[PDB]
Structures are given as structure tokens and as C-alpha cells.
């Protein structure tokens, strides 16, 4: 793992709520878990063909988003796990994330940008 840490992630549909998740950046893939020691990830996000951009949020600090450039409306390819264990495709067009400090933000971006390239 090149980087791991707690981050708040925005999810839901109509009402979007922030969830604290444990992220693990590892070779072209960004995983996230509910608990720091869980064996199976709550989500896997392949980084190929994605970019990051900082964004401003009204309720949360140090945010940034994973997104598909020039997106005409497609969803980010990713797998997700359901409370019943069933695996399904992610339903995000973008992943908005909140880092605890501005420093953790720049590190995560630098780490992720570098993880999207040489692969
Ligand atoms: O807990 P509640 O309030 O029900 O909201 C859930 C969680 O935020 C999920 O995050 P996590 O999987 O990290 O627990 C998220 O899945 P994503 O991981 O795909 O964001 C769901 O988004 P959608 O199922 O896509 O609407 C959203 O409905």
C-alpha cells in the first residue's frame, strides 16, 4: 500500500451523506473499507482513465473528486459490496472525498495522480 487513511466519502442518491471510510491506494486501484482491518473491501475503484480535481463543498473541508474527463454522462467503473455480500457495479459518476486536513488532501492527490499514470 502506497497510502492508506481515513477519508469521508459522499454517496447516496436523493439525500447524499458523508461516510468515514478507510482508503487504501494500491497500484491503479483505490479501495475503501468500513473498518481498518476488514478482509474484504466495501469498494474498489480502478484509477485508469480517471482524473482528480479539487472542488469546493459547502459543508466539508479539503475536498476533491475522482471523475471521467469530458464525461458526457457515464458512470465510473467500480465494484461495490452490499450488506448481503452481493457484488454490484458502482453507481457514481464522480467520487467526492473529504480529507481531514489540507495536507492530507495534497498527499492523497499526489499519491493518486501518480498511481493513475505509469500502468
Ligand atoms: O448508508 P446510506 O445512508 O444508506 O448511504 C449509502 C452509503 O453512503 C454507501 O457508501 P459505502 O458503500 O461506502 O458504505 C454508498 O455506496 P457507494 O460506495 O457506491 O458510494 C451508497 O450509494 P449508492 O448505493 O451508490 O446510492 C449510499 O446509498
Rounded to whole angstroms, the Cα distance separating 61 from 56 reads 8
Between the two ends of the chain, the Cα-to-Cα distance in Å is 16
Atom of ligand 1 nearest to the CA of 32: 13
With beta carbons less than 8 A apart as the criterion, state whether 24 and 65 touch.
no
12 lines ligand 1 (CB under 6 A): yes
CATH topology of domain 1-119: PH-domain like (2.30.29)
C-alpha cell at 36: 481498518
Annotated resolution, angstroms: 2.3
What is the residue extent of each domain of the chain?
1-119
Binding site annotation covers 14? yes
Q: How was this entry determined?
A: X-ray
CA 101 vs CA 11, 18, 67, 78: distances in Å:
20, 16, 21, 26
Residue 25 annotated as lining a ligand binding site:
no
* 91 CB within 6 A, ligand 1: yes
Amino acid at each position: 500500500p502506497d497510502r492508506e487513511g481515513w477519508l469521508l466519502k459522499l454517496g447516496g442518491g436523493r439525500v447524499k451523506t458523508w461516510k468515514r471510510r478507510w482508503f487504501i491506494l494500491t497500484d491503479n486501484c483505490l479501495y475503501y473499507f468500513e473498518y481498518t482491518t476488514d478482509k474484504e473491501p466495501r469498494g474498489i475503484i480502478p484509477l485508469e482513465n480517471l482524473s482528480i480535481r479539487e472542488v469546493d463543498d459547502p459543508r466539508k473541508p479539503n475536498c476533491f473528486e475522482l471523475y471521467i474527463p469530458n464525461n458526457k454522462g457515464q458512470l465510473i467503473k467500480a465494484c461495490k459490496t452490499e450488506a448481503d455480500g452481493r457484488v454490484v457495479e458502482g453507481n457514481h459518476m464522480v467520487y467526492r472525498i473529504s480529507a481531514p486536513t489540507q495536507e492530507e488532501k495534497d498527499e492523497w492527490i499526489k499519491s493518486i495522480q501518480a498511481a493513475v499514470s505509469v500502468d
